[PDB]
Amino acid sequence: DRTFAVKNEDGKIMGYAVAMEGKVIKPLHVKGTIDHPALAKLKFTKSSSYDMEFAKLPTEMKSDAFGYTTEHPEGFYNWHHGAVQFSGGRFTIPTGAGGPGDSGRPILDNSGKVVAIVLGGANEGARTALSVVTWNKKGAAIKTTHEDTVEW
Numbered sequence: 001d002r003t004f005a006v007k008n009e010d011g012k013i014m015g016y017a018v019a020m021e022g023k024v025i026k027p028l029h030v031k032g033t034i035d036h037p038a039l040a041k042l043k044f045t046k047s048s049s050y051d052m053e054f055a056k057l058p059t060e061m062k063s064d065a066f067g068y069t070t071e072h073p074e075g076f077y078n079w080h081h082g083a084v085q086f087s088g089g090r091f092t093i094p095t096g097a098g099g100p101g102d103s104g105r106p107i108l109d110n111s112g113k114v115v116a117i118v119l120g121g122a123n124e125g126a127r128t129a130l131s132v133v134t135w136n137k138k139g140a141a142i143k144t145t146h147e148d149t150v151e152w
Contacts, residue, residue, distance in 0.1 A: 002066050004039060006104065008032040015152070016104030020066035020114055024055040027103045027119050027133075029151050050143045051119055052133055066106060069113040070137050077115055078108040084130065089144070091116055091130040095123055098130070103152040107132070122146040 015030030042055035077084040081097040107116040116132040
């Protein structure tokens with residue numbers, strides 16, 4: 001288990017957090033507590049520029065953490081709701097496949113490695129371009145925001 005629900009006071013899922021490369025990672029706008037005993041009360045460092053906050057992964061996990069990859073050839077990828085196309089520097093899904101509550105879900109290749117973290121989507125009719133966080137070869141974070149993005 002490597003993906004965790006972020007729940008508010010009522011218990012409603014507001015988004016998701018991932019265990020990835022010695023870190024706990026969740027979108028900044030996603031409000032609530034991570035539904036996991038080892039993850040609930042950690043010290044988080046926030047980044048408004050990239051809509052991301054992170055904590056040092058509890059050393060009881062470690063073996064349960066995603067690997068990240070900087071290799072995103074053009075093609076199709078995996079996420080909880082189906083196929084994500086990567087084409088022209090853009091991650092897209094069919095409109096309707098993603099919505100509020102999906103912020104924080106990872107986009108994966110077939111080897112099970114993370115390529116991106118979902119922040120939200122801009123509706124373009126048939127397709128929805130996903131706003132994401134990726135990391136370059138230098139390890140630097142990149143936020144890709146599209147025109148008229150809806151936070152999820």
